Design a protein around this ligand. Structure first.
Ligand code: CL
Lengths: 12, 183
């Protein structure tokens, strides 16, 4: 992953 | 002759098909979403995808009736994926009762409800999913199961860091839940 980053949905 | 959409179902993959009530008085048909006007389709779907995002328990409840519970957007997500992602234990149990496919995989990565509940670190939801009977062995398009993915994200979260320390306890619980299924 790109760091801890995980927003496959788009909530940000 | 298009009066209104009075039903829906998914076709092929990431593609809706709707049940048509005609005004002129014939039988109801099914049509490919692209056959009918965009703003007709929009006024039908928009409430659903709005509610899904706000994880609104009761909206979803009344919008259920002739609509396909696993209605999919363009990326193959269903409202179950969105609500798992937002942590709504309720919306998950609601949609579960309605008959939503727990093992549904979206198409932008193969992800499922569990991957989302694990990804956004949603321990309560992960519990509900396992308990409702989701298959925990389902793999995403990298081969990763839900569990493996918690492990993978956990590794990369800065360890002696007071700020991301919250997620830490989070990911651990996710892992506790899922491992209690394998071991
Ligand atoms: Cl949760």
């Amino acid at each position: 992953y790109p760091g801890g980053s995980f927003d496959p949905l788009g909530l940000a | 002759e298009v009066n209104k959409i009075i039903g829906s179902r998914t076709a092929g993959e990431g593609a809706m098909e709707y049940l048509i009530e005609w005004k002129d008085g014939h039988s109801p048909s099914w049509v490919p979403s692209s056959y009918i006007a965009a703003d007709v389709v929009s006024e039908y779907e928009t409430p659903w995808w709005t509610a899904a995002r706000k994880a609104d328990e009761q909206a979803l409840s009344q919008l259920l009736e002739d609509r396909d519970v696993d209605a999919v957007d363009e990326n193959g997500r269903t409202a179950l994926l969105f609500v798992a992602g937002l942590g709504s234990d309720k919306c998950v149990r609601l949609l579960a009762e309605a008959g939503a496919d727990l093992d549904h995989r979206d198409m932008r990565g193969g992800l499922t409800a569990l991957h989302m509940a694990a990804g956004y670190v949603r321990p309560e939801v992960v519990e509900a999913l396992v308990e409702l009977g989701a298959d925990i062995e389902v793999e995403d398009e990298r081969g990763l199961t839900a569990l493996e993915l918690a492990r993978e994200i956990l590794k990369t979260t800065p360890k002696g860091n007071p700020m991301q320390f919250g997620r830490r306890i989070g990911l651990e619980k996710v892992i506790n839940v899922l491992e209690g299924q394998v071991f």
